[model samples]
Target: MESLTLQPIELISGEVNLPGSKSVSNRALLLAALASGTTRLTNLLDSDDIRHMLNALTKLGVNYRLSADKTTCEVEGLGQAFHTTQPLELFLGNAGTAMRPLAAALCLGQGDYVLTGEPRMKERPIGHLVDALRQAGAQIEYLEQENFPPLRIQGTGLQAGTVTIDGSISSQFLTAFLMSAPLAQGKVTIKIVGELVSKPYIDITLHIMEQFGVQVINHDYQEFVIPAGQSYVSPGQFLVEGDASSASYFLAAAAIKGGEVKVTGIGKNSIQGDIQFADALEKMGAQIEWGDDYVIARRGELNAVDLDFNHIPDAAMTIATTALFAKGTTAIRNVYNWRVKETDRLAAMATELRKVGATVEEGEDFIVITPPTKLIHAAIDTYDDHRMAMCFSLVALSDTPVTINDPKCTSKTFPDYFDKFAQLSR
Candidate 1:
C-alpha cells in the first residue's frame, strides 16, 4: 500500500549517471567465476538481480570479494566449469539473468543442483532452456510444474553434439546454452529453431564470451558451433557499461519536457541493444546528441509512432508513456514475450494507461495507445514490475499529478530511481 505522489513538473533538466547493466554484470560474473585467472569487474550493478547472481556464485563455492559499495568485484576463477561435492540449492530471486544462465552452467559440472526463485519467477517459463539442456545430455527435472522453474539439475556435465533449441520465446535460453557449450565434453553444434526473439541479446552473450577467451562460431544467428577443449580464461579487467534500459526513462523525460538532459556511461561504443531507444525518441521529434560515452535529449513537438519493439522490449515500455505526451496514437508491436516476464506487462500496461485516460487497444503481442486530450490524475499500479514503476513516472510530466504505488519496486534494477527523478524535476 506504500506510494509516492509525483507532482506535475513544468520543466526538467539534468545529467543522470546510470547504474551498470544488469545483463552485463550478471553475465560477466558467471564467466569470471568459470575462467582460469582472477577477474576484476568494475561498475558492477548493485541491485536485486546482481545480488542474486553473487549469492548463487558464493553458494557454488566460487570465491569473490565485493567492495563496500558492491560496484567492484574480484573473483578468483575456478578455471573450469563448476563442480560441487554435495547437493546445493540456489535461490535466484526473480532475476532471469541469473536463473537461465546459471541453470545451464550448473549442468556443466558435477553435483545435484536445485534452482528456485520468487513466485513470479516460478511463473516465468524455463522449459525452452531445459529442453535444450536435455538435448545436450543434461539430467534435469521439473520439480513443481512442467516447462517452468523450480528445477532440479543433476550436474553430470553436458555431451558435445547437435543440440537444437527453440528461440522464439527468449534469447536467454540460447545464451545459457552457448555459455555452457564451450565447456561440454566434445564439440557442440547448436541449431536454433524458430525466429530468434531479441537477437541483439545474443550479441551481448557472444561479446562477453570472447572477453573470457572462448570462441563460438555463430552461423548467422541460426546455428552456433563451439569447439572442444575450450575453457574460460579471464580477461583480467571487465567493465560493465551503464544500463541502457534504465537510461530510457531519463531520456524519455527529457524528450517530453526538457531544457535538454544528458545521460552518461553508455553511448556510441556501448554494446547494449537498448541504446536504440535514443533513436526511437529522435523519430518521435526529440533532438538527440550522441557521443562515445553519453547521450543528450531535448524536447520537441512530440508525435506518435508505430514501430516493432521486439528487440528493445524493456525500453519500449517507456515509449508507451511517452506517447501520452505526443500528438497521436502510438503502437508498440512484436513484443509477445512481455506476457512471460515478471508480470504480464502487456496487460498491466493497458490497465494502467487506461487509468490515465488513454484509450488503449490490447493485443496478444502488442498494445496501441491513444493519448487523452488532457491527462488525468491517477494512482498507477506497478504490479511488482520494476520497469512498470519506472515507465509510469513519466506520467507526471503532464499537468496531472501521478501517484506510483510501491515505488520501491524499482529496486529490482535502479534502487534510487525516484531520487534521480526528483533531481531532474524543476
Candidate 2:
C-alpha cells in the first residue's frame, strides 16, 4: 500500500526512451521458449509482468539467461512442447497477458500445472479460455470458482478441431488459443462469434506468431486457422519496439503542461496498435511530428473529440485523463472490455476524475469527461491497478498537489514508471 506525493510538475521536457512494449515482450518470451534453438530478445521490458513470465518459464525448466540490467534475455529453446516433471505452481501477478496465453500453452504442453495470481487476478475472467480449452479436450479445473484463476490445468495433447469463443471481453483469450493451436494434434480453427473487440491486439498476436515461424491464417476478423504440426523456429534474435501506450503519458504531458517531449524507439513502422493514439491527440489539436526513431509532441490548446477505443483498451486510461485537459466534452466509446482489467477502469476513472474537479460520466461501454475550469489537489486510490496509478499521475501537471495510494502497483507493468517520470521532469 505504498503511496507517492507528487507536487505539481512544470513543463520541462526532452527526448525520452519509453520502455519496450509489454504486449510484445510477453508473447515473444513464450514463442522463444517454444522454439527450436536459442532466441535472443533485445529491449525487453524489465517490468514485474515480464519478470513473472520469466519466472514461470524457469519453473517449467526452460533455460534462459537474463542480462545484468534485465534489458535483454537469451532463451535456449526446448524444440517441442514438454511437460513439467512435477505439478508446478505459477504466480502470474495480475498479468493477464502472461496468465491467459500461458494457461492455454500449459494445457497443450502435457503436465499438471496450477496457475495462480494476486487476488485481483483471481477476479479477472478466464472462463472463455477455460471453455475453449475444455472444448479442445484439455483437463481444466477451477481451484476456486468456475471462471476465475487459481485453476489447475492438466496438460494433454489437444484434439485439434474448430472452437468458437467470444472476443468481446479481451483479446488475450483469442491469443491464448492462437499460440497453442500449432501444437494441437489436428489443424486448429477458431471462430470468433461476437463483435471482436481489440482487433489490433489480435493482429499483434498474428504478427508475433509469424515472426517466430508460425503461420496463422485470418479470415475477415471472424475466424483464424492454424495448420497442424507447425512449431516455432527461433529467429535467433527478436527486438521489442517502444510502447505507444506508455508514450501516451509523455504526449499528454506535452499537451497538458506545455512542453516539447520526443519519445524514441517507437515509430510509424511499429506494429503496435496503440500507436494510433497519437492521431487521437492530434485530432485534439496537439502538434505531432515524427522521426525515424522518435515521435515528438508539442503542446497546444486542446479541444475534445469523439473517440472509439474498442481496439486500444490500454490507451483508455491515458485518453480518459487527457480528456480532463481538453476544452470540450470528450466521449470515448466501445470499451466494454475495461470491466475485466485489473480494476473496472471505466468506473474507477470516473470516480477518481471527480476528485480532481472533472465531470466524468461512466457507462457500460463508454465514458465522457469534461474538463474543469481549474484543477484541484486530491488523493487518488489506485485499486492496486498499475494503469490507475499511472493515469492519475498526469493530474500532477495541473500545478495541483496530488497523492497516489498504492503507488507500488505500477510495478505490475511499469516498475520504474514514476522514476522515469521524474527523469523526464528534470
Candidate 3:
C-alpha cells in the first residue's frame, strides 16, 4: 500500500489548469471516432479512466494518434458504426462514462461486443441502459448479475422507436440512449421514467452531440427526440474544458485556507455540473470570483450549509471534508447514487471522517458532518477511491498532519493531484 502524509499547511494560493473533463473527453473521443472528419482534441485528460476509453478505441480499430503526454488526440473519424468481423470485449474499469456510453455506441455497429470492467465495475448497474436499448430492438445480455455489467451485446441492428428508461439511479443510461439514438434505423423518442438524477450530464451529452453535428429536441429533460439519419460530424477542433470535478479539491482548499486559489479551465461558461460547486461555496461564505475560463476562491468565515447535492455528487465530497472548518453541521442530501460510484462513497466518507474525529451521521442517501472541537491528527484510509483520497486532504488545512493511505488512487481522475495540490500550497 502506498501512502502520502500531508504536512500541515497554513495557506494555499495558486493557479491550476485542471486536466480535461473526463465526461467531455470520453464523449468527444467516441463522437469524434463516429464522425465524418478528423478531430484534433486538445487538453485531453490523460488518466486511468480516460486511458480505458482510449485503449478500447484502439482495440476497436479506431485510428487515433496520441501526443507524447497523451493530452492531444488526433483521431480519424470512422463516420459510421463499427463493422468488425472479430468479436470485441472492452474493459472500462469503473468509468460509468466510458462503459455506459460505449455500450450504446457499440450497439450501433456489427459483431459481438462485451463490456467488462474491474470487480467493482461488475457491481455497478447497467440495467437501465440495457432495458431501454432492448426496447429499441438492441440485443443485449447480462453475463454476470442480472442488472450489472459484464454484458454481452449481439449487435446486428436497432429499430428506433419510442422507449422509456428509468433514470432514478444514473443519468448515464439516458445519455447512452440519446447518443446512440440518431444512428438507429428510425426516429427515436425517449421518455424518462421517474425523476432523472444528474440531469446536467444529459446537457453535456446534448451539448457534445450538437458540437459533433447532431441535435436532439430536449423537452424539459423529460423526453428527447432524435431524428433519423443523423450521424456524428466532426467539429474539426474540439477543446475539452478543464475538469470541474478535479477542480473541487483546489477550490475547496482555497475556501478553507486561501490567499486566493484560482483554477483555470472550467468557469462560468463550462457545461459540467460540478462547476456549480463554486456557487455552493459562495453560499457557505467564501469569496468566489469567476472568469470566462477560470474561478477563484478566497478564504472566508465558513459556515455549514445543508443542501441537496444530487446534481454534483462528485464535487459534493469536497464539501464534506470542508465541513471540518465550518461553524455548524453540514448535510449533503439526495445523493443515493453515491453508493454505486467508485465505492460506497457515503459509507466510506462517514467512516473516514470519523477516523479524523468528526461526528458524522450517515443516512441511506445522505451524510451530516459536525466538525470536532479541536482537529485531531489521524491517518485517513482512502478505500481505493480517488475522491476519498483527494477530499480528505482537506484535513491538512488544520494544525495536524494528515496521512492518506494509498494516495495514488487519484490516478483514476487526477493523476497529479497531490503535486498540483502541493503547487497551490505555500
Candidate 4:
C-alpha cells in the first residue's frame, strides 16, 4: 500500500471540476444496457468501481463503445434483461453498489452466475439481500458463509411480486432489487419494512429508472411498485452530474483552510442528496454561494454545530474530519449504518482523531468532536476504503503534516483522488 506524506498545506484555493457521480454513472450504465436501444453516457466516472460494473455488464453480453478520449461510453442495449448461456464469474472488487444490485439483476437474468470479490468483500454482509432474493424464488448460495459474500446465483425463474426488505442497513439493497424488478415475470412491488437509510440514493435510482422509461410508483416511504411488462428504453444520450459526496471534501477544505474554491459540474439543484452537506456547513458558519452549474464555498471561522447524517452516510467522513477543525463541539447524529460499511467508521474516525491530538467520542449513531489546540502529525490508516483516504486528506490543511497510509485505497472509487487534491492545493 502506497502512502501520502503531506507537508502543512496553506490555503486550498482553486477551481476543480468534480468527477461525475460514481453512484449515478454505475446505475446509468446498468439501466442503459438493459434498455431496448443504444444509450450514450457522458461524464461517466473512470474509476475502479465503475469499471467492475462495466466488466460485469460485458460478461452478461452487453456491448459498448468507448470514446477516443475515454470519458464517454456508448452502450448497445442487451434489451430488457441479459441472457447468459454460460455461468458468469464477476469480480466486484469492493463496490457495494455493484455487488448488491448486480446480484439482484443476475437473479432476474438468464443463467447461473458467481459473484465474488476481494478478501474484505468476502466478509461484508449479504444475507439480507440473499433472503429477499430467495423469497422471490431466486436460487442463491453462499460460497463462503451464510451471511457473507462469494455468492452463487442460478437465475432461471424469478417470481417477482410484493416482497418486503429491511432497508435500515443500507439503501443499496433496495436499490439493487428495484433495478432488477422490471425484468421479473410479474409486477414487482417492494415493501420497505424498516427505516430507509440513504433515501436519496433510492431517489437517484428511481430518477434514472424514469429516464430509461421505467415508471416506478412509490407509496409514500413504505412501498414501491413497478408495473409488469415495462422495459427500459434507452435515451441515446445521458450525462452523469458531478458527485455531491466528492464535493463535500472540497467544501470542507475551503472551510478549514480559509479560502474560496468553486466546484463546478454540480450545484444547488443537483439531485444528489449529499448536497445537503453544504447547507449543514452553512449552519456551521461557512459562507456558500450557489449558482446554476457551480457552488462557491469560502472559509468562515467555523463554529461547531449539531447535524443529522442519516440521509448522507458517505458524507460522514468529511463531517467527522471537519469537526476536528471547528471551534467548540461538533456532533453528528443518526449514522448507525457506519458499523456495516468498509470499516466501522465511527470507531475508525475516533481512533484516527485521537492519534491527531483531538478529543473524540462515538455513541450508537453519533460522533462528537472537540478541536485540539494543535493537530499532531500521525500515520493515518485508510482501512482500504476510498472515502477514508479522501476524507482524511483534509487533515493536511492543518499546521502540522498528516501522513495517510494506503492512499492507493481510493482506487476503489476515485483512483486519482490524491492527484486531484495535490493539483488543487498547489
Candidate 5:
C-alpha cells in the first residue's frame, strides 16, 4: 500500500472549486440515460464510481460522449427502460449509487442482467432493494449469499401497486424504488415500512426526478406515490453541484486550524443534505460564512457536541475526527447505517481514532469520542474506505504528523483528494 505522511500544518487557507457530487453525478447519469433526447452533464464527478455507472451504461448500449477530462458528458437517452434480449453482465465496483439504482432500473424493462461489484460491494446488502422489487413482481435471484449483492435479475418487468420497503437500513433502497417507480407498469405507491435513514438524500432524488420532468409525491417521508406512464425527458443542460460530503473535510480542516478556507460549488441553497455539516461546525465554535454558492470556515475555540447525525451520515465522520480538537466528549448517534456503508465506519473510525490516542466508545449505532491531551502520530489504515482515508487526514492539523495508508483509495470519489488537501496548507 502506498502511504502519504502529512506534516503538522501551521495554517490552512485557500479557495477550492470542488468536484461534482458523487451522489448527484450517478443519479443524473442514470436519469439522463433513461430520459428522452440528448442530455449534457457538466462538472460530472470524475472518479471510479462515476466510471462504473458510465461503463455499465455503455454495456447496456446507451450512447453518450465523454470529454477528455471526463468532466463533461453528452448522453443520448434511450427514452425508456432498458430492454435487452441478450444476457448482460455489469461490474459496478463498490459504487452503491450505481448498483442500487441500476438494480431497480433494470427491473423495469426486460432481459437477463447480472449486477456485481468489488469484494466489499458483495458484502454490502442489496436485499432491501431486492425484496422491494421482488414484492413488485421482479424476478431477482441472489447469486451469492442471500440478502447480499452479486444478483441475477431475470428482468421480466415490474408489476405496479402498493409496495412497502424497509427504510431503516438505507435510503438508497427507497431512492432506487422511486426512480424506477415512474417507469413501472402502472401506478405505484411506495410505503416506507421503517424509519427512513438519510431522509435528506430522498430530497435529492426527488429534486433530480423533477429536473428530468418526473414527479413523485412524498408524504411525510413515509409514503411516496408515482403515477404510471411517466417517461423522463431531457433537462437539456445539467450542472452538478460540488459534493458537500467532500467539502466536510476542508470545512472541518478550516474549523480545526485555518486563517479561512472557502469551498465553492455547494452552499446554503444547495440540495445536498451534507451542507448541514457546516451548521455542525458552527456549533463547535467555528466561524462560518454561508453564501449562495460557497461557504467559508475559520478556526475558533472548538468544543464537542452531542447530536444525531443520521441525516448526514457521510459528512458526520468529519465531526468524529474534529472531536479530537474539541474541549469535551462528542457523541454521534443514530448512524447505525454507518455499518453498512463502504465499510463499517463506526468500527473503522474507533480503531483509527484510538490509534491516535483518543478515548472512543463504539456503540451499536453511535460513537463517543474524548480527545487525548496530547495527540499521537500514527499510521492510519483506511480499510479500503475513501471516507476513512479522508477523515483521518484531519489528524495532520494537530501538532503531530499523521500517516495515511493507501491514500490512493480516495479515487473512489475524489481522485486528487490529497493534492487538493495539500493545496490549502501553509
Candidate 6:
C-alpha cells in the first residue's frame, strides 16, 4: 500500500490528452464483440475495470487483438449470440461496468455461465438486472444470495417482449438490457420503472450502440424500443473519447489554483454527461473555455452551489472537495446511488471532510459541506474508492499540504492518474 504526499502548490496548469472513457471503452468492446465484421478501436483505456471486461470477452470466445500500447484494439465480431459448449466462470473484479453489462450480455448466449466478482462486487445488488432479464424469459439463477451476483446463468437465447426494468438503482442494468435486447428473437420494448438515475450514461450507451450500427428508439428516457431483426454491425472504426469523469479532478484543481489547465479529447458534443461538470464549475464562477476537442478551466472566485447532481454522480464527487474552496456551503443532491458505488461515498465524504476541518453533514443520500475558515492538513483515507483519492488532491490548493493514502486505487480507471496530474504543476 503506497501513498503520496502533496506539498502546497502555488500554481497548477497544463494540457493533458485524457485517457479514453472507461464507460465508452467497455461498452464499445462489448458491442464490437457482439457485432458482425471487425472494429478497430482507438484510445481505449487500459485499466483494471476494462481488463475485467476484455478478459471476460476472451474467455467467452470473442476474438480481438490489442495494440502494443494496449490502447488500440482490432476485434473480430462473433456475428450473433455466443454459442459455447464449455462451462465458463468470469471474475469481473470490482468493476460494476463489467459485471452488470456482462451479466446481461452472457444471458443471450448458450451453455452455462457464472458471473462472480470481488467481495464488494458481491455486496452490490444485481436484483433489478436479474428481474428485468427474467421478465424477458432469461434463465438465470442466483448461485448465492438472492438479488446479488455469483449467479449461474443458463443461456438459451432470448424472446423479445414487453419488459419493465427498475432504473432507480443503477443505469447500467438498463444499459445492459438495451445492449442485448436487439438479439432477442422478437421485438423488445423496455419500460423504465421510476426516474432513471445517471441519465447521461445511457446517452453514452446509445451513442456506442448506434456506432455499432444498432438503433434504439428511446422514448423520453422512459421507454426504449429495440426492433427485432437488428444486429450490431461494426462501423469499422470507433474512437473512444477522453474520460470526462477522470477529467473532473484536474479541472477542479485548475478552478482552485490555475494558470489555465486544458484537458483535450472531449468537448461540447461529448456523449458523457460528466462533461457537464464544467458547467457547474462555470456556475460557481470558474472561467471555462470549450472547443471541439478541449475544455479549459481557470481560477475563479469559487462559490458554493446547490444543485441536483444525479446526472453526473461520478464527477460530482470532485465537486464535494471543490466546495472546500468555495465562499459558502455546497449541497449535491439526488445522488443516493452514491451509497452503493465503490463505498458509501456520502458517508466517506462526510467523515473525510470533517477530518480536514470542514463542517459536514452526511444525509442518507446527500452531503453538505462548509469550507473551514482555515484549512487543516490531513491524510485522506481513500477507502479503496478511486474517486476519493483523486478528488482529495484538490485540497492541495490550500496552503496546507495533503496526503493521499493508497493512491494506486486509481488503477480502476486512470492507471496513470498521478502521472497525468504531475505534468500539470509549476
- Give candidate 3 misplaced runs (Cα > 4 Å): none
- Compose the digit string of candidate 1's lDDT tens values, residues 85-203: 88989999899999999999999888888999999999999998998899888899999999998999998789989989899989999999999988899999999987799988999
Per-prediction count of colliding residue pairs?
Answer: 0, 0, 0, 0, 0, 0
- TM-score of candidate 1 relative to the true fold: 0.99
Candidate 5 lDDT (Cα, 0 to 1): 0.94
Candidate 3's residue-wise lDDT over 23-103, tens digit each?
999999988988899999999999889999998889889999999988999999998888878888889988888999988
Lowest lDDT sum, 10 consecutive residues, model 5, at 151-160
In model 2, which runs have C-alpha deviations exceeding 4 angstroms? Answer: none
How do the residues 15-133 of candidate 6 rate in per-residue lDDT, one tens digit apiece? 99999999999999999899999999999999999999999889989899999899999989999888878999999998999999888888898878889988888888899999989
Predicted candidate 5 versus true structure: per-residue lDDT over 351-383, tens digit per residue: 999999999999999999999999999999999
Q: Candidate 4: which stretches are off by over 4 Å?
A: none
Tens digits of per-residue lDDT, candidate 4, 259-305, equal: 78888889878889988888888888899999888988899878888
Q: For model 6, what is the error of residue 105's alpha carbon versus the real structure, in angstroms, after optimal superposition? A: 1.0
Candidate closer to the true structure by TM-score (higher is better), 2 or 5: 5
Of candidates 4 and 3, the better by TM-score: 3
Off by over 4 Å in 5: none
Error of 6 at 84 (Å): 1.8
